Design a protein around this ligand. Structure first.
Ligand code: ZN
Ligand code: ZN
Length: 55
């Protein structure tokens, strides 16, 4: 298989993969700290929808 780049949609960085969430609709990655407002911790739950897709 191939590796996806998964850069943060907001900042363009790949740092702190442990602090990134992937949107289960649009498949884009986000740092929790790049969201406006930021999420404080990576939720233990494996489902997540970005601000665009949740609405
Ligand atoms: Zn970011
Ligand atoms: Zn999304």
């Amino acid at each position: 298989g191939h590796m996806r780049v998964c850069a943060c949609h907001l900042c363009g960085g790949r740092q702190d993969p442990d602090k990134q969430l992937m949107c289960d609709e649009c498949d884009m990655a986000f740092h929790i700290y790049c969201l406006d407002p930021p999420l404080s911790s990576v939720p233990s739950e494996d489902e997540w929808y970005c601000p665009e897709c949740r609405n």
